[PDB]
Design a protein around this motif. Sequence first.
Motif, mmCIF file in Angstrom:
data_model
loop_
_atom_site.group_PDB
_atom_site.id
_atom_site.type_symbol
_atom_site.label_atom_id
_atom_site.label_comp_id
_atom_site.label_asym_id
_atom_site.label_seq_id
_atom_site.Cartn_x
_atom_site.Cartn_y
_atom_site.Cartn_z
ATOM 1 N N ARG A 12 0.806 -1.216 0.000
ATOM 2 C CA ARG A 12 0.000 0.000 0.000
ATOM 3 C C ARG A 12 0.838 1.265 0.000
ATOM 4 O O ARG A 12 1.947 1.283 0.529
ATOM 5 C CB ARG A 12 -0.922 0.009 1.222
ATOM 6 C CG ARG A 12 -0.263 -0.496 2.507
ATOM 7 C CD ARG A 12 -1.256 -0.536 3.670
ATOM 8 N NE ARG A 12 -0.822 0.265 4.810
ATOM 9 C CZ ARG A 12 0.018 -0.171 5.745
ATOM 10 N NH1 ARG A 12 0.523 -1.391 5.643
ATOM 11 N NH2 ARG A 12 0.368 0.606 6.774
ATOM 12 N N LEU A 14 2.076 4.865 1.201
ATOM 13 C CA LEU A 14 2.168 5.491 2.521
ATOM 14 C C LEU A 14 2.074 7.020 2.440
ATOM 15 O O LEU A 14 2.056 7.701 3.461
ATOM 16 C CB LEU A 14 3.447 5.037 3.248
ATOM 17 C CG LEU A 14 3.588 3.521 3.483
ATOM 18 C CD1 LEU A 14 5.061 3.131 3.709
ATOM 19 C CD2 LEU A 14 2.706 3.028 4.666
ATOM 20 N N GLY A 15 2.008 7.559 1.226
ATOM 21 C CA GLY A 15 1.976 9.001 1.051
ATOM 22 C C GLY A 15 2.368 9.505 -0.330
ATOM 23 O O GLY A 15 2.852 8.741 -1.180
ATOM 24 N N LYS A 16 2.165 10.806 -0.546
ATOM 25 C CA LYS A 16 2.430 11.439 -1.839
ATOM 26 C C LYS A 16 3.395 12.611 -1.663
ATOM 27 O O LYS A 16 3.369 13.292 -0.633
ATOM 28 C CB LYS A 16 1.123 11.890 -2.512
ATOM 29 C CG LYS A 16 0.027 10.802 -2.566
ATOM 30 C CD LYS A 16 -0.387 10.449 -4.001
ATOM 31 C CE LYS A 16 -1.404 9.302 -4.046
ATOM 32 N NZ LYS A 16 -1.717 8.846 -5.443
ATOM 33 N N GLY A 17 4.239 12.835 -2.672
ATOM 34 C CA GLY A 17 5.402 13.713 -2.565
ATOM 35 C C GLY A 17 5.190 15.196 -2.312
ATOM 36 O O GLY A 17 4.048 15.617 -2.142
ATOM 37 N N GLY A 20 7.090 12.807 -5.600
ATOM 38 C CA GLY A 20 6.807 11.410 -5.856
ATOM 39 C C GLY A 20 5.907 10.693 -4.877
ATOM 40 O O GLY A 20 4.924 11.247 -4.389
ATOM 41 N N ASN A 21 6.247 9.441 -4.599
ATOM 42 C CA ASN A 21 5.403 8.593 -3.780
ATOM 43 C C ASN A 21 6.184 7.602 -2.921
ATOM 44 O O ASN A 21 7.240 7.099 -3.324
ATOM 45 C CB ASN A 21 4.413 7.838 -4.672
ATOM 46 C CG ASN A 21 3.169 8.654 -4.983
ATOM 47 O OD1 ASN A 21 2.535 9.202 -4.080
ATOM 48 N ND2 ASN A 21 2.814 8.740 -6.265
ATOM 49 N N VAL A 22 5.647 7.317 -1.741
ATOM 50 C CA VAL A 22 6.195 6.273 -0.896
ATOM 51 C C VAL A 22 5.226 5.087 -0.808
ATOM 52 O O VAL A 22 4.024 5.261 -0.637
ATOM 53 C CB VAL A 22 6.510 6.819 0.518
ATOM 54 C CG1 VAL A 22 7.153 5.741 1.391
ATOM 55 C CG2 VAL A 22 7.396 8.049 0.420
ATOM 56 N N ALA A 35 10.441 0.627 3.097
ATOM 57 C CA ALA A 35 9.666 1.641 2.399
ATOM 58 C C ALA A 35 10.407 2.058 1.131
ATOM 59 O O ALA A 35 11.629 2.258 1.143
ATOM 60 C CB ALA A 35 9.415 2.856 3.297
ATOM 61 N N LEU A 65 15.788 7.994 10.055
ATOM 62 C CA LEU A 65 15.303 6.975 9.139
ATOM 63 C C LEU A 65 16.428 6.520 8.216
ATOM 64 O O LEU A 65 17.011 7.337 7.502
ATOM 65 C CB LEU A 65 14.146 7.518 8.314
ATOM 66 C CG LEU A 65 13.268 6.460 7.659
ATOM 67 C CD1 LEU A 65 12.356 5.875 8.712
ATOM 68 C CD2 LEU A 65 12.466 7.056 6.520
ATOM 69 N N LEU A 81 14.292 2.756 1.751
ATOM 70 C CA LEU A 81 14.366 3.344 3.079
ATOM 71 C C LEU A 81 13.869 2.380 4.121
ATOM 72 O O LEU A 81 13.170 1.418 3.807
ATOM 73 C CB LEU A 81 13.516 4.614 3.140
ATOM 74 C CG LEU A 81 13.915 5.783 2.243
ATOM 75 C CD1 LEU A 81 12.732 6.698 2.028
ATOM 76 C CD2 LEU A 81 15.068 6.534 2.860
ATOM 77 N N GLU A 82 14.237 2.652 5.372
ATOM 78 C CA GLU A 82 13.691 1.941 6.522
ATOM 79 C C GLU A 82 12.180 2.165 6.598
ATOM 80 O O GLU A 82 11.674 3.230 6.243
ATOM 81 C CB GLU A 82 14.368 2.417 7.813
ATOM 82 C CG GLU A 82 13.830 1.785 9.098
ATOM 83 C CD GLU A 82 14.346 2.471 10.369
ATOM 84 O OE1 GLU A 82 15.255 3.323 10.266
ATOM 85 O OE2 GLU A 82 13.840 2.147 11.471
ATOM 86 N N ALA A 84 8.832 2.581 8.870
ATOM 87 C CA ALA A 84 8.335 2.943 10.192
ATOM 88 C C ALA A 84 6.890 2.454 10.342
ATOM 89 O O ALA A 84 5.965 3.019 9.749
ATOM 90 C CB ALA A 84 8.437 4.459 10.414
ATOM 91 N N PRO A 85 6.702 1.385 11.130
ATOM 92 C CA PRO A 85 5.408 0.699 11.263
ATOM 93 C C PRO A 85 4.305 1.540 11.910
ATOM 94 O O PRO A 85 3.127 1.319 11.621
ATOM 95 C CB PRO A 85 5.740 -0.503 12.158
ATOM 96 C CG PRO A 85 7.243 -0.627 12.127
ATOM 97 C CD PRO A 85 7.747 0.761 11.962
ATOM 98 N N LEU A 134 8.477 10.090 12.056
ATOM 99 C CA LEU A 134 7.855 8.766 12.087
ATOM 100 C C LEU A 134 8.238 8.011 13.362
ATOM 101 O O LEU A 134 9.166 8.423 14.088
ATOM 102 C CB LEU A 134 8.266 7.952 10.859
ATOM 103 C CG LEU A 134 8.076 8.634 9.496
ATOM 104 C CD1 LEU A 134 8.914 7.961 8.400
ATOM 105 C CD2 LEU A 134 6.621 8.647 9.105
#
Length: 247
Positions: A12, A14-17, A20-22, A35, A65, A81-82, A84-85, A134
Amino acid sequence: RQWALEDFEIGRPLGKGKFGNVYLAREKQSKFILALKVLFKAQLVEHQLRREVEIQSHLRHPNILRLYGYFHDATRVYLILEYAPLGTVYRELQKLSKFDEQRTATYITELANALSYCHSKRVIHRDIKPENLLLGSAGELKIADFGWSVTLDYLPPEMIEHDEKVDLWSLGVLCYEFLVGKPPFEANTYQETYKRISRVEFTFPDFVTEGARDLISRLLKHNPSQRPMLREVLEHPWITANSSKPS
Ligand SMILES: Cc1cc(CN2CCN(c3c(Br)cnc4nc(-c5cncn5C)[nH]c34)CC2)no1
């Protein structure tokens, strides 16, 4: 050591830039959760990012991070990237309304430890928003920024009107936001917010304790030169009393 998009299963977003996107992601072989940030070369700043990734890939700290690595194709650049839960500090504040002094001071300690670790490398950080903070599996705070070097509410007077006094002002806005539920200079308009920061006009609600007011007041100085050293923040008796983590 190289990397490719087909090395990962994607989950899924996790966010928008941020250009870009994560996405939550998994290395196919090891099944290792991480991530993935995907940035596009057009909005590429391009030279700058290269230097950012240069520095971030050398930063090892429990409260930064981790950047495991990066790769790129013709159209995009990928950041491994690491993960973050537990999500953002900004989101946690929304749920809790505001933090107690122990949760607050432990975060400040963690932020100050990270910033000092970086200071020990002539790397400094600019301004700091809670949405970019995070939380790992153990509740430990983690800096997730392209704000390393060498909204108005979060900017010190000198950004609106190794020279790292900016992130000390940041510690003070966050500490206030953490205890209070909203940043110190919040106002109905942009013009009003601007003057409040510029004039350093903030007040505390009665529940805010004295050791807290003290630390916050020493951090929110117009004159960058008068703001405390990170060392002094970690040794602040209100920090020392309340934080569960050490230097
Ligand atoms: C480009 C770009 C920047 C962003 C903003 N973005 C949000 C998501 N990002 C995360 C990273 Br990197 C690492 N771990 C994360 N864990 C969460 C999370 C877990 N549960 C809820 N959330 C939000 N987000 C993570 C940081 C930066 N979007 O595109």
